[PDB]
């Protein structure tokens, strides 16, 4: 399993 | 799945 | 601002 | 899916 | 300001 | 800042 | 920055 | 097994 | 920068 | 064995 | 780059 | 024996 | 038996 | 890209 | 006796 | 691409 | 895609 | 016999 | 007689 | 999808 996580700025 | 939730001011 | 939301199901 | 919908003030 | 809609298919 | 979570179980 | 952490199974 | 780790900037 | 390592037994 | 081993900048 | 070598048994 | 060699530059 | 020959650039 | 050569024997 | 032609574009 | 071509005569 | 045909003998 | 025909597309 | 009749995926 | 048809006499 890939656990992804966190936050993007931009598109 | 990955859930993608919030906002931009930039592209 | 841009609202973001939905998924990425298919990477 | 991932939906966008707002207004950038600038690129 | 520059209106932004749609959608990503490939994030 | 748009969160990005959640898991890629298949590729 | 979004972590990604994990393992492939189905690729 | 194939293992993943480390990070992504806007996906 | 996502570093990936390991092995593909069966996909 | 396939083995594996890099680094990847996007999933 | 994600460097791949290796082999299969049965293909 | 199926042998493989060389490098991806994504998954 | 059955011969295989030539590249790959996906997994 | 991944160099792919050989023979599979045995199916 | 089984005859084998064509190509793949994955492992 | 990969080219297989070739015979299987014993399963 | 790879094309099969023929016969099974030594199953 | 045991008779075949049709196609892989992946092996 | 043992007959045989269907469909498969690999070889 | 390989088609499968036929009778066994022996192995």
């Known amino acids: 399993?890939?656990?992804v996580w966190?936050?993007?700025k931009r598109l």
Request: glycine residues 16%; without cysteine; aromatic residues 0%.
């Open 1 to 3: 399993k890939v656990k």
């Open 6 to 8: 966190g936050s993007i």
